[PDB]
Structures are given as C-alpha cells and as structure tokens.
C-alpha cells in the first residue's frame, strides 16, 4: 500500500511538472481557438 501511494504521488508530481514545462502539451485545445480566431479574422479581411 505504501509503495503504491508513493508511486501515485510521484506520478502526479511528474504530471504537474510535465504540464508546467511543456507549453505545447495543450496544443490540441489551443487548436480550436486558433481555428476560430483565424476564421473570424479571414471573414473580416474579406470585406476589404
């Protein structure tokens, strides 16, 4: 039990550290916002 608990805690710490260090980890979620913003900008640009 103690070993499993320690492993779980260490894994959660590694997860938070990886999330903090890796700025591109959430790229899949930034992608939708990027598409929406770019589509809106392109629609605006079409007026010119």
């Amino acid at each position: 039990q103690k070993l499993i608990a320690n492993q779980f805690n260490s894994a959660i710490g590694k997860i938070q550290d990886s999330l903090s260090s890796t700025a591109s980890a959430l790229g899949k979620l930034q992608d939708v916002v990027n598409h929406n913003a770019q589509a809106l900008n392109t629609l605006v640009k079409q007026l010119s």
């Binding site: 605006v44 640009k45 079409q46 007026l47 010119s48």
Partner: protein, 48 residues
C-alpha cells in the same frame, strides 16, 4: 461631436461618433485605416 451623425468628410460619407483622437498622426498623414480597410480616423480639412 460625441453624437451619431451622418458625416461627409472630404468626400467620405459615413455614419458614426466623432471624438477627439489620442493617436498622433505624422504631419504628412491625413487619413487612417483600421483592419479590413475600414476608416478609423480622419483629420478635418478645415482645421486639420
């Protein structure tokens, strides 16, 4: 000023609110543009 009015500025027709500008045009500039070729600012031909 500070009222929605139909303006005919130097041949430019439109509707909007005229307010004092806080952006410093260079002396040679006399007409501003926003994104999508939208007129954002203009200088008075009679008072500059």
């Amino acid at each position: 000023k500070n009222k929605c009015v139909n303006f005919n500025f130097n041949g430019l027709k439109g509707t909007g609110v005229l307010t004092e500008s806080n952006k410093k045009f260079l002396p040679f500039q006399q007409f501003g543009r926003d994104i999508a070729d939208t007129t954002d600012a203009v200088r008075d031909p009679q008072t500059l």
